[PDB]
């Protein structure tokens, strides 16, 4: 019984996780929407 | 370390495993949007 996760996942979350620690946002879930929106929008 | 971080990171990953989205970044926007609006 073996599965895996796509490449990018852990690094994707690492980037999110890093900025959480730096900025210490009051609401983690909304910070996520914002953080990831920028990623989506950056192209 | 903020409370609720580990739980958050795990929940996302688990949904990525269940649903196998093609775009992880965009699925993240949606997954976390659904989380914030779920209350």
């Amino acid at each position: 019984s073996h599965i895996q996760i796509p490449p990018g996942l852990t690094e994707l979350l690492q980037g999110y996780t890093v900025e959480v620690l730096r900025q210490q946002p009051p609401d983690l879930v909304e910070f996520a929407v914002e953080y990831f929106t920028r990623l989506r929008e950056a192209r | 370390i903020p409370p609720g971080l580990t739980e958050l990171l795990q929940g996302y990953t688990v949904e990525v495993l269940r649903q196998q989205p093609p775009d992880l970044v965009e699925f993240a926007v949606e997954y976390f949007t659904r989380l914030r609006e779920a209350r």
Partner: peptide, 28 residues
């Protein structure tokens, strides 16, 4: 900031590790 990047790496690694464990023990 270097210790911050290393810390985040572990938390993710831990969250993913448990996300895999959860999904395997959820399917079967």
């Amino acid at each position: 900031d270097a210790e911050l990047v290393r810390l985040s790496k572990r938390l993710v690694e831990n969250a993913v590790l448990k996300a895999v464990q959860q999904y395997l023990e959820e399917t079967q």
